[PDB]
């Protein structure tokens, strides 16, 4: 389990770590404010998928530190020792850099903390790509 964080359209590596929490929260049809209810012309509204994902220990690129929107990929061949086939490159291209301060200070620094981040969307829904 590893994360390669790159700047989209720039290709520069941001940091490497290991993902610990992966969330794939599904859409909920409870709001009732979806619209087009009484008329019901056509069922078009699909899932408003929400996905959150974090990392363990970020190691930022030294070259990227010099000059002081972003893609991301992973590697996983652990199940059934299928390393030659069944490759899964979890590709969210427009992951949003997020995260909170969370001043704990009662354990000291733990290298890099758990960086919050989620995948955004664009004109065409490209939230997640297995390849």
């Amino acid at each position: 389990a590893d994360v390669y964080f790159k700047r989209k359209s720039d290709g520069k590596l941001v940091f490497t770590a290991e993902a610990q929490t992966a969330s794939f929260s599904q859409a909920i049809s409870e709001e009732k404010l979806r619209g087009g209810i009484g008329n019901k012309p056509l069922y078009i509204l699909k899932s408003e998928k929400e996905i959150n994902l974090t990392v363990k220990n970020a190691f930022f690129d030294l070259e990227w530190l010099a000059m002081t929107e972003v893609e991301y990929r992973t590697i996983a061949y652990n199940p059934d020792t299928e390393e030659v086939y069944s490759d899964i490159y979890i590709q969210f291209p427009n992951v949003s850099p997020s995260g909170e301060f969370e001043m704990s200070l009662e354990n000291g620094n733990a290298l890099a903390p758990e960086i919050k981040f989620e995948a955004l969307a664009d004109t065409d829904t490209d939230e997640m790509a297995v390849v």
Partner: protein, 669 residues
């Protein structure tokens, strides 16, 4: 400088200088580099290798690889080998450390006063040899065993007289005087500071044990991890990489090992019991959740396979030791432990039968160590209650069943309590004949206890020897108990209580014994009626019997009228009126006088007049007590189905109880 994770890996934390710890692991794989050191230096490296591998220290975090590891507890005390301790005390003395193990075994065995004396002898002999570590630990352990005896006599002084039926004084008043004198003006907080400094700089890792509230850093971390895990469970997040559930699992084992090893008496402390109880109960909760988890289209493939967590022998001991019977029930009602695989079952059965023989010796030969008994009955009960989830052999079951129905004191396990546990054992494996023989001897023993002729079967659950016969008849359709059969000739209207005993033990009596009973002893009051139905003696509402029910029903109104004038409202939980109503609900009994009775019991009015019954007073908990067929065929009728439907629809979202959900799924479709 370096942070040692509980998994086994290490990571630089404040090592701003050379990576010596990484260098040590760098030489771990390089054979030739180790030989390049001096002979003594190479020898030290070998010793550190033995220490690190025993302590579970693994290589650098970069070379993670497989990190799943099962810890082992070599301490005999944790395994409850009470027989081994008995001979371990009388092995004289080889070394102070060997005496330290003896003292810890002495405390666990229950001989606390002897253990305290042993701890007193340890500190006096620990002046030299620079062995302050055992002196340090014994000083704390002497304080802990001093604390334990103070509450022990306090429990005997208060709450002890009624529980045991009398007062027990395992410790002489002089001993209680002696222990407090040696413990005067002793504050344990500064023990690490108030003790020579060469220890203070070398054994710094032991500073966390001096304070009385030493069980705080782990519990706080467990509490934070419990919150972190519960967040994942609600949100359904997939724990990639190292997962907190594995972390807490490893942390408790390290805490369990570090305390049972090195002979720390705090292992029997309730906070440690609380620490383990909350630790494993969280693990059971996530194990149940993982099995009952939605298979999402993303992240379905990860490190955890199918049924990633397995119940092992060590977990069973912890469950059987650091849990109480009520908390186990909460675990059962929250998580179905029968679904999760129980590994190394053969390594658990000998522990269960091993705890049975200790029970057998305690309550059969002479007396029992009461101080040990209090510290052991909770573990003893928790082990037998949890035995339902493990397959057991015929020989293993026989000893446990013999222990269950022949040695447990009634003060902690009444007649009703044993049947609940008996059913658990009987449900796991089909009842063989050998177990029935032990059960049969139990019932006849109770009959012979009627020598005083004032003993009455009183049970907490309301279940009597009535249920033991039902279990026997359920598994063995035809079974006659000779010992009870022969007893009837000698009894001729002499012991009425023993006479009443036979009525609810009828299906195990012979043809001649049953003929002699009903010859002139039979049903006279309403109590024997439902007993006969459960027995099977009474099958139809004879005209005389229907008179008995309404006659008792008439009595209730006499008190009902008078209590309303003064505002009283008697609601004794006899539930007989509910039984009368459910019979009338299928018009199996057609007397109209009892239909006149109304406004007496809320359940009773429900059955008699379904349509016009005030459903606002209906209680959904009564539905848990109802049969299958009546609920199943009532669907579609809609004369009274619709009224209860409103309650049924409410319970699925209001309550998380699975029993309510099952009722609305199997029926009312």
């Amino acid at each position: 400088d370096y942070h040692f994770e509980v998994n086994g890996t290490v990571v630089r934390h404040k090592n701003k200088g050379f990576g010596y710890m990484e260098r040590f692991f760098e030489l771990k794989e390089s054979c030739d580099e180790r030989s390049k050191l001096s002979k003594k230096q190479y020898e030290r490296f070998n010793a550190l290798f033995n220490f690190f591998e025993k302590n579970g220290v693994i290589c650098m975090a970069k070379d993670a690889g497989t990190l799943n590891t099962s810890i082992e507890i070599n301490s005999l005390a944790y395994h409850g080998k009470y027989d081994v301790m008995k001979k371990f005390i009388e092995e004289q003395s080889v070394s102070i450390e060997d005496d330290y193990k003896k003292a810890f075994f002495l405390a666990c065995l229950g001989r606390w006063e002897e253990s305290y004396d042993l701890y007193s002898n340890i500190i006096l002999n620990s002046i030299d040899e620079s062995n302050g570590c055992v002196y340090y630990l014994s000083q704390i352990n002497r304080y802990r065993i001093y604390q334990s005896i103070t509450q022990a006599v306090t429990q005997f002084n208060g709450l002890g007289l009624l529980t045991f039926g009398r007062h027990y004084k395992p410790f002489t008043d002089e001993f209680l005087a002696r222990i407090e004198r040696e413990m005067t003006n002793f504050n344990i907080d500064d023990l690490f500071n108030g003790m020579p400094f060469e220890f203070q700089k070398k054994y710094k890792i032991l500073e966390f044990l001096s304070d009385n509230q030493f069980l705080y850093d782990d519990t706080v971390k467990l509490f934070e991890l419990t919150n972190k895990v519960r967040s994942e469970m609600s949100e359904g997040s997939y724990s990639f990489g190292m997962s907190s559930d594995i972390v807490v699992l490893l942390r408790l084992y390290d805490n369990l090992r570090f305390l049972y090893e090195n002979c720390l008496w705090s292992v029997s402390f309730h906070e440690f019991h609380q620490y383990i109880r909350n630790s494993m109960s969280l693990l059971i909760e996530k194990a149940e959740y993982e099995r009952t988890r939605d298979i999402d289209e993303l992240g379905f493939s990860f490190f955890g396979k199918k049924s990633g967590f397995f119940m092992e022998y060590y977990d069973f001991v912890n469950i059987s030791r650091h849990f109480k019977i009520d908390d186990i029930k909460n675990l059962e009602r929250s998580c179905s432990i029968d679904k999760i695989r129980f590994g190394e079952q053969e390594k658990i059965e000998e522990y269960l039968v091993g705890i049975a023989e200790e029970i057998t010796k305690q309550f059969s030969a002479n007396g029992m160590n009461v101080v040990f008994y209090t510290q052991f009955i909770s573990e003893a009960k928790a082990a037998l209650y949890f035995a339902k989830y493990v397959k057991l052999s015929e020989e293993g079951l026989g000893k446990i069943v013999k222990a269950l129905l022949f040695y447990f004191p009634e003060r902690d396990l009444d007649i009703g309590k044993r049947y609940v546990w008996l059913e658990r054992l009987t449900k796991c494996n089909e009842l063989p004949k050998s177990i029935i023989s032990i059960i049969d001897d139990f019932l006849v023993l109770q009959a012979e206890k009627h020598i005083d002729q004032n003993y009455s079967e009183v049970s907490s659950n309301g279940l009597y020897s009535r249920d033991y016969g039902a279990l026997i008849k359920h598994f063995e359709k035809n079974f006659i108990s000779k010992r009870l059969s022969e007893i009837t000739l000698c009894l001729t209207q002499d012991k009425q209580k023993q006479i009443d005993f036979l009525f609810k033990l009828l299906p195990l009596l012979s043809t001649n014994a049953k003929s002699h009973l009903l010859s002139f002893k039979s049903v006279e009051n309403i109590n024997d009626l439902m007993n006969g139905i459960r027995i099977g003696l009474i099958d139809e509402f004879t005209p005389e019997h229907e008179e008995l029910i309404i006659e008792y029903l008439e009595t209730r109104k006499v008190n009902y009228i008078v209590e309303k004038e003064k505002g009283i409202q008697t609601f004794s939980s006899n539930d007989y009126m509910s039984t009368f109503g459910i019979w009338y609900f299928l018009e199996e009994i057609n007397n109209s006088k009892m239909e006149e009775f109304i406004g007496m019991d809320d359940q009773y009015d429900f059955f008699v007049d379904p349509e016009n019954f005030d459903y606002k007073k209906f209680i959904p908990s009564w539905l848990k007590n109802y049969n299958d067929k009546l609920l199943g065929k009532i669907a579609g009728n809609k004369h009274m189905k619709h009224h209860v439907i409103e309650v049924l629809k409410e319970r699925v979202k209001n309550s998380n109880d699975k029993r309510y959900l099952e009722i609305l799924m199997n029926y009312f479709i």
